[PDB]
């Protein structure tokens, strides 16, 4: 859906500019050339032949576009981590089929490794944070994303404390 | 919460779609995570094509949800009868 934009380096005053596609056809002129909306089949070999009072030189070293294509494949992460007591702990996201995935945190989280699926964090606060999975591919950035919380609950200083047993007579309640 | 499960084609190369919201992580995966899922019933579809044969062979599988009751068992109080035969 971008374009592409190969551009020539200029020649002779009057010099016209041709570009040739992957399969030997024109596909416009002037130094820069501009394949607009571009598409996967726009993508691959391009090249260009410098024109001069009827003459054309040899043409010139062969580039590639390359057109990405946006994937099918949803980011998704695991479910909710719930923590007793812990500030550390590991990351749970499905791996992309075709793409690259990549982590960010919110308050102090810090994670070890963003680009993995299965990464280490370990400064956690106490309360929540939450992650997000943000999957792309190449040059289509920020295509896809996904939230994931990890909760955390310090432990508590209070100990089950219970009474003493009694020694009730005729009582039916207590 | 699931994953789906299809068998892998021999030579061929598999695709998911869904239904009713449903979500695939991975639609080209027949071993694919799925996160978004309705309660009730939805119908994922199995898709199996070949290079320029596209949309050779199809199949239909379903994933039940139900949500949890929040009724739980509540029996009676136990009784003491008295030459009785029913109760």
Do not use: H, K, R
């Amino acid at each position: 859906g971008s374009n592409i934009v190969l551009s020539a380096n200029a020649g002779a005053a009057g010099t016209t500019y041709e570009w040739f596609n992957a399969s030997n056809v024109s596909v416009g002129t002037g130094q820069t050339l501009t394949i607009v909306g571009a598409t996967v089949a726009d993508a691959g070999d391009y090249y260009v032949i410098t024109t001069l009072n009827s003459c054309s030189s040899a043409a010139s070293s062969t580039t590639t576009a390359i057109v990405d294509q946006v994937p099918s494949t949803a980011a998704f992460a695991g479910n909710d981590i719930n923590l007793c007591n812990s500030f550390t702990t590991t990351l749970d996201a499905t791996p992309p089929n075709s793409a690259t995935g990549f982590w960010t945190t919110n308050s102090g989280a810090t994670i070890a490794n963003p680009n993995l699926a299965n990464s280490a964090v370990y400064n956690l606060p106490t309360g929540t944070s939450t992650f997000y999975w943000t999957l792309s591919n190449g040059a289509c950035i920020d295509f896809s994303v996904d939230s994931m919380v990890v909760e955390v609950t310090p432990a508590s200083t209070d100990v089950a404390d219970a009474g003493l047993d009694q020694n009730l007579c005729g009582q039916t309640s207590a």
